[PDB]
Amino acid sequence: NWSVDDIVKGINSSNVENQLQATQAARKLLSREKQPPIDNIIRAGLIPKFVSFLGRTDCSPIQFESAWALTNIASGTSEQTKAVVDGGAIPAFISLLASPHAHISEQAVWALGNIAGDGSVFRDLVIKYGAVDPLLALLAVPDMSSLACGYLRNLTWTLSNLCRNKNPAPPIDAVEQILPTLVRLLHHDDPEVLADTCWAISYLTDGPNERIGMVVKTGVVPQLVKLLGASELPIVTPALRAIGNIVTGTDEQTQVVIDAGALAVFPSLLTNPKTNIQKEATWTMSNITAGRQDQIQQVVNHGLVPFLVSVLSKADFKTQKEAVWAVTNYTSGGTVEQIVYLVHCGIIEPLMNLLTAKDTKIILVILDAISNIFQAAEKLGETEKLSIMIEECGGLDKIEALQNHENESVYKASLSLIEKYF
């Protein structure tokens, strides 16, 4: 209800009390979503004043009021976030993290969270001014059970944003010193802390083998697999995403996931009521069956293959696509014995029914899978037996249906398969 000018007057005033009233009047105007006069405040050159107030240790109200108004500005337009950053707000917030006032510190943590969350540029900039060390210091406590719930969530969310986004990815050295704290947070009992922490790890593991390697070496994977079987969907989702990303790495990094007892959990994931979970879990399976033969064998030992033909047969189409890729990788890198087992699990008919799909890439992948199964049949000298096995179902008739020059990629693929075998 104040005029923007009344605010400029009170702030430019000599009386610190009148400056506080003005700063508070500003907050109420900026905190109002729909419609804050953000631009009007910035134009008035009020940001350098707010940043100056952050340093007033002898007055926590003006610190809190100005910090609030600042984060409100840094929430809207990107250009408005830049106005706050160019005002020198980041170093001021960092100097506020070690404040003896819990609510002031919390205010600064939340501020750095918003800024870093708006983009990879602001993120790295918050990291550069030395925000990481004070942030972790606030969590350098023996047992975190002695910390307030809201206080810890706020801190975990900021840390999460320091881990998020790409182009460029978070500086390697920052991730190095943040990670040991993320492992501890993963052993907390609060579901919101766990969710944010799993998301942070999923961001970190969403990169090259070097990044995955760092995450895996902390010994945090067994804990991820524990959360993988939690009741809260908001935890299972990011946990599963993290495992899916790690499994996208090297064969040895994948092996850590298997040794952590992940495979025994996937029967429930593949049959989870949420289709999104089936999708992610099937996708993870795909990358695991793309690994070594002894790793495929461990997938077999856990009785996962029957579950795999099941989703390939009944799951929704986006999950089925993931299942197709999982099968093709299995037939691609698997042994003769393993491929015979796959066929005995009844993979053929479900795989042949997807040949009616209107997705060129999928059709080609399935034809490659059938080719790999035939190659396994060659080494055995039972190519002719598999041929009839495909004639039992609509298989042959469905491969012939692909011989349409409307799609000459699919034509050549199926034709190459028909000339032999059949």
Q: Report CA-CA distances (Å) from 320 to 186, 282, 316, 335, 354.
A: 32, 8, 6, 23, 8
SS3 273: coil
Between CA 117 and CA 74 the distance in angstroms is 10
Tell me how far apart the terminal alpha carbons of the chain are, to the nearest angstrom. 83
Contact 117, 161 (CB under 8 A): yes
Contacts of 418 (CB under 8 A, 6+ apart): 399, 400, 403
Cβ of 353: how many Cβ atoms within 10 Å? Answer: 16
Q: Which technique was used to obtain these atomic coordinates?
A: X-ray
Contacts of 161 (CB under 8 A, 6+ apart): 113, 116, 117, 123
Between CA 69 and CA 81 the distance in angstroms is 12
Cβ of 420: how many Cβ atoms within 10 Å? Answer: 11
Q: How buried is residue 44: exposed, middle or buried, by Cβ count under 10 Å (0-12/13-18/19+)? A: middle
Contact 316, 362 (CB under 8 A): no
Between CA 354 and CA 319 the distance in angstroms is 12
Between CA 48 and CA 60 the distance in angstroms is 18
Between CA 224 and CA 403 the distance in angstroms is 47
Between CA 219 and CA 212 the distance in angstroms is 12
Between CA 90 and CA 134 the distance in angstroms is 13
Question: 């500005």: which residue's tokens?
Answer: 73
Between CA 306 and CA 341 the distance in angstroms is 10
Which CATH code of 3.40.50.2000, 1.25.10.10, 3.40.1130.10, 1.20.1260.10 fits the domain covering 1-422? 1.25.10.10
